[PDB]
Symmetry: D2
Subunit: 108 residues, 4 copies
């Protein structure tokens, strides 16, 4: 009972909703970042379990991917890490387009 379906909030104030998880682990949702337009997300959970998803920013040329795992101790918490890819015009600048960080979500 650490199911991803429902509403989540993070340490920076951002929100996300995740809908039902189908028999093959897939799910859909929305993400609202606190630092802003709803943007759709798409992902998968392995069949406690680990999971990944992609967020296609509706207001920026970027993409973010998240991966993580759901825990209990219980309070439920998703521990994630992400990559944020910026758009560059030339291949010469590719070296500077990827940022990395973390995020901890708890239920809303």
């Amino acid at each position: 009972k650490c199911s991803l379906t429902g509403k989540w909030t993070n340490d920076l104030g951002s929100n996300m909703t995740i809908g039902a998880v189908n028999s093959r682990g897939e799910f859909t949702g929305t993400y609202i970042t606190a630092v802003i337009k709803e943007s759709p997300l798409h992902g998968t959970q392995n069949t406690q379990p680990t999971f990944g998803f992609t967020v296609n920013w509706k207001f920026s040329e970027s993409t973010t991917v998240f991966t993580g795992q759901c825990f209990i101790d219980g309070k439920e918490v998703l521990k994630t890490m992400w990559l944020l890819r910026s758009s560059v015009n030339d291949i010469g600048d590719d070296w500077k387009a990827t940022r990395v960080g973390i995020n901890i979500f708890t239920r809303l």
Copy 2:
């Protein structure tokens, strides 16, 4: 026309096929890794933002409790080659939250067309 649809290979010998990209940027595919149970085709799911647009996708390993996410951009250069420059995160499964610090690996991959 640096379009993701088709077949790709990487620096480590892995393959992937990506199907058509719908009006909302979404796509589906398969990934066969040359390196590590034993290895199997695994499905992938992702999205492209909407000439050299950025993209992301998740791979759900059919043979392991892990998950990998890839993000990148499609370029043309240097010699005229189409190339996807990616970075990925590979998340392993842990039993306790105390070991979470140790569960994420990071690297890169360059794909060219097959």
Copy 3:
């Protein structure tokens, strides 16, 4: 108003570190005891930036594990937190040793750490 790295620090996972004086050129030395084979004090070596009239400078250091074939590097900034406290916000890389170049792809781990004064 400034944020000096000299002294003793603890983190979110229970680990400790001591950092000695910072010389005129930003260099420093220290020791690292990780809370997470048997664990031992390990030396660290690093630098802090000294560019503009800057009171929260960035910095980096390397830890040479005395009990493992690995290496970790940390990089961050020193803040005066909202609460008057001093805090180091860091990210790290942990590199394992592999025997062949073919396995290099799987040798690097990444995470974070927040340190506060002891």
Copy 4:
């Protein structure tokens, strides 16, 4: 083979020199970057690092920090020294580049990541 001392070049055109490695694995050096993405005035910058010295029968891992002389940033690199499929000596590294932010609220966006392959000059 595979001793870090000497001169190196990378895939982006940058250079670095590393001096002698003492008994405790420490070393010093210099880094000249070919790319700034800033208002240049690019300059030699000093580096400091360490190489591991447990079980000397394969190639050891190492880390170092670069203190940019022209920018408020810092980069750290970590990696291992190999002999490659082609007979070359090669350092495979990954790095983190930390930018300076003014408030703690913007910390989440201050770290970039990538890779670099060095071969001897």
